[PDB]
Symmetry: C5
Subunit: 310 residues, 5 copies
């Protein structure tokens, strides 16, 4: 009969969420309870009823007794797992308690930035049993798994935390146990309001206000400058994401700013040649519509982006 391996994973810190590399790093602890009756002992007269081991001594003991351990792997770990404690407690009836405290980075392949920065992302850690389920069957350790009270993450807010058990077939024909700890996180938007939204809005609006001069050349100069600045914003914002194969909401907004600025310049050149070839009064009359249409474009385009993505 397969042996039961109870698994608990506890995330104590989120040291970082790297959206460009699409990974996240955590400090967490793994707890395993596994009753192996072959490990049963009897303490000596007035002798310890629980035996404490390093991971190394325990594995050497298991090899000497020819006992297979429930070997596992963090399936989506990437890089070096920095271990703090790898401790074993062995009770008299053969129950092995294992504590593994670590820091490690994990892949986040469910990142979808289409709604960025209004996106809710899925983060998980997979713990895979290497041996098949007719040898070991992972269970859920009760009252341990989850997320901690001081995760130390400022941009992200955890919205849902979940655990469950599934299967994998990485190395065996038969099914092998997989423990999953997953959580969902959304962003705090204050950073994007302050550093991205409000600057762009101020530039656009300050341009509109300066449009009341009635000097078409000034409009063209200012609009060219605004386009340059918007392209600087494009490069800055794109730096923080991966080189995605699809368009983000932020990309749509920035392309809108590019296009609206260019159309502003074009309309101003038409007005300036209208005033150049004698049509100054027609130029001013149409300047009325230029003013009364600069912000209609931005409102309408914002509604269009909302309709598309949401």
């Amino acid at each position: 009969e397969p042996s039961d391996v109870f698994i608990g994973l506890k995330i104590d810190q989120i040291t970082g969420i790297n959206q460009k590399e699409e990974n996240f790093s955590v400090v967490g602890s793994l707890r395993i309870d596994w009753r192996q009756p072959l490990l049963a002992f009897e303490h000596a007269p007035g002798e310890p009823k629980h035996r404490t081991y390093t991971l190394a001594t325990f594995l050497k003991l298991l090899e000497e007794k020819q006992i297979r351990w429930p070997a596992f792997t963090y399936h989506n770990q990437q890089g070096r797992m920095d271990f703090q404690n790898r401790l074993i407690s062995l009770s008299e009836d053969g129950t092995v308690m294992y504590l593994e405290r670590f820091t490690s980075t994990f892949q986040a392949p469910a990142f979808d930035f289409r709604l960025f920065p209004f996106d809710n992302q899925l983060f998980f850690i997979h713990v895979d049993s290497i041996f098949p389920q007719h040898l070991f069957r992972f269970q859920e350790m009760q009252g341990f798994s989850g997320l901690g009270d001081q995760l130390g993450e400022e941009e992200w807010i955890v919205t849902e935390v979940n655990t469950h058990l599934t299967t994998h077939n990485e190395f065996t024909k038969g099914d092998a146990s997989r423990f999953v700890l997953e959580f969902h996180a959304e962003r705090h938007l204050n950073y994007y309001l302050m550093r991205i939204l409000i600057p762009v809005l101020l530039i656009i609006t300050v341009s509109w206000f300066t449009f009341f001069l009635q000097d078409y050349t000034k409009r063209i100069d200012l609009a060219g400058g605004n386009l340059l600045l918007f392209i600087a914003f494009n490069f800055t914002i794109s730096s923080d994401l991966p080189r995605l194969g699809y368009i983000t909401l932020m990309d749509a907004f920035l392309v809108g700013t590019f296009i609206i600025t260019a159309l502003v310049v074009l309309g101003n050149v038409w007005l300036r040649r209208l005033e150049n070839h004698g049509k100054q009064a027609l130029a001013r009359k149409l300047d009325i519509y230029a003013i009364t249409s600069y912000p209609l474009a931005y409102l309408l385009g914002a509604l269009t982006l909302w309709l598309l993505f949401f």
Copy 2:
């Protein structure tokens, strides 16, 4: 009866304080005195009264004698702890002296940047007993714990250092000991006066002085440039912080600069159209108030920020 484990933590260096990642790194040393009578020995004729061990040999000896060690964990450590010395001295009556010298990064989850750069932050290191308090009870080693004389930190100044003992329930139903070494630090403000405050003040004041030209178009051009520069300052300053979900005092000051610059531009456009449609004398009379109100806004807004945050 529970065994007493005396704990001392000494911080010798602050190698860095990373406010963006909200962590800090230290070079420090841990001292543990723990009397285990089972470890008592007798030296041979004219033989050493104290035995020196590596951590590895000592733990193998403890496992061979089936003695549980007071296993501990740096609860808020993140990443790899680089150990320098892990030494053991065992006296004849069984007193274990342990020296652990290390470099490690630690989480700083109490960072609150609301008053930045006038903030005083709390930094701590937690040392957790893995086993419950009916087995081991942490005490305070006397005359060892604290902070050193050459911390090597230039921006921060330590204001208070403290130690105490509390409990945790990370891995056991029963309470387990927790040793805390905490200190409070504030910033030196010279960097912010020289690189942030004085440049912004110079830009604002040089703009005001140039406002005495009486050429409204020059005001608009200069103000647009000033707004661009202030947004560059926004991006630079925000780069050094995390993507906070709340507004910092620095954010409030930068938003004030944005808004005041935009209002300057708007007032200048109104003046320029007043001079455009025949009201040159009214334009100049109101230019008087424009000048006499440019700095009132900045003083009043600075007082408003002080009132809000302090």
Copy 3:
């Protein structure tokens, strides 16, 4: 007779493709099946028919029995291979199953950026037998090798995956086995359309539209600014590549932008001196051709680049 070593390499993650350093990093797993009859055992009465080892214990056992293992090396690995599991399963007839799970960076010396960003690159991992082929002959493990379902790579798309066996002579006069896992990848072009192509097109076209002012000095000013911006784009784009000894398609396009902008400026200076020394009407007539030739240059040059590289 040489011993057969069956090899399987599975790539589970592409943690990154570094085109500047010309390397790529993966999380993957290596599987080796190797029948060594000298390792045959018999389980005790009702005793395990498969023995589980750490890599270290197994190698010590092999050394004690004076059995040569099929030593191998990742020929194009660079840096530190971070191992997760190094596990051994030994069956009763002497079949060794080895599992090696790792993270490592690998050289990508086949990077050819001539068509960048329309390039398809070759990535491979070489696994080399250190000992010659009269001792060990690598075979292909069936149903294991390849690439996974969640590679986590956003810019690149895998187009072909392949495995095969070849030889090398790194350390022996005789041939030694080499296992190769290779795959081809191309880029998603969305990043380059949004962040590179469309901004450059907008700048060029907005310049052309502003050319309808009929103010030659404005043309010269705007063109100088455009040249400056294009050189900023040159530096940015080149930052992401290595310091290649040959010209990339992107380099050709940027040099074209430089030259076309300079020719624009030159033509405008000629027009401005034509209008300066009395030939205003001739200046305007030729301005017709200036306008009707600004975009012909860009279309013709784009066709020329396509002809050259493709």
Copy 4:
């Protein structure tokens, strides 16, 4: 009687001096000669008169014989010491020769940037005896300690190298030996002349030359631009230092550039309003003093900075 431990530290490379983190990294080698008569042996017939050990085997031998080793610590090491060789040679009379070759970073808490870039800094490595001086007394190994011939450091020049012995009380009530290797270094100034001094001088002087136009508005525009550029220089230069709590000479020079530029702008606005309200001839007469006082300010301020700091 305390045992003599002769110490030699040799610095072979300076891999880097990090003035922002206030540390420096070296490749060096440590030599220890320590006569322990308990380690005396006799070679077998025609057998080696010197025994070669790894550090690990030697420490296991010492533990088996219950011999305390002279445990030491690099007191100002920070981070991971990457060891190359840790070798032991044991002669027949019990003299242990130890070779430790390493790479490591070390704290530089004596950095004082007040005169930067004309500063001479103190760099040291402390080697601390953990055990008190009634057990071990550090001596100086003769003809080994110092700095090498190829340090590989380009910006810094070593001016003085010194060794000596002192005491510490880190872990014991009694005094413990401390070996110090210190050296003083100054900078090559060519980098600062070429990249900092000459650009600033060129900007200032080119501004002065352009002041001979007699167009006050051009002066104001150019001066505003110069102030912006000087603030860019401020941010760049400050990036390379820590966030110091005191003013550097470079900070004083940059603040001088800010202030002189602002005063230039102010004087030009006064001249422009003098010419505006009818006083063109008075404006020109005072423009004479404006010109004849622009460089007096810079010379006088440079002398003032020299007087203050030197």
Copy 5:
């Protein structure tokens, strides 16, 4: 009699050349053949004629037999050497074959940037015998040492590869063997033509062409902008080098650009005041020489730089 240690070093990859840190990183392999007759064995009946060891087991065997190994050190290694394989093959007559495959960074203290980017640099790896030459004498392993076919380096081209044997006295009074593998490399210049040379040439020439306007103020404005851009190029280019104590050819060229631009501005101010105080015709006549002398300065200065450095 001293024992012969045959040495072969093979460089398979150049993972990077870091000219700012003046180091280079390689993936390479070390081969050592060393006949120690004390290691001679006899295989059992039908038993392996060659014994395979890990480095650790072999060193423990050597210590047990009290055999001194030829201990060596990579003299100019800096940082951590990441080992891939450390394998031993021991033949029946006692010949030890050692394979060491590694990744490591090495100091490049022969970097001389005076002719940069037309410089040919010397790169070497030193392998030092720790023990003196009356114990071990390094020889050259034949047919192994050198550089590989896929070095993976794009900017540099290897021009000469060499090996030889010399001596050192690092740790012993007597001479100890030193094996040297050195190679010379030069740069591909395409990067510097495309990203540095051609942009600067375009800026200079586009300025000259715009000089045919005959509007001195435009010349001054454009020249000031060009000086600013050249100083940006100075900072960018200097970022990639160390903070050298001497002047590079690139530094000379950039200082030339600064000075020529400033002289352009000065001449234009003189022309503008000549036209201001009534001498418009003299101003134009001398403008002829201004034009006919702008490029003479650049050609003459380029010849001067060539004469100085070459």
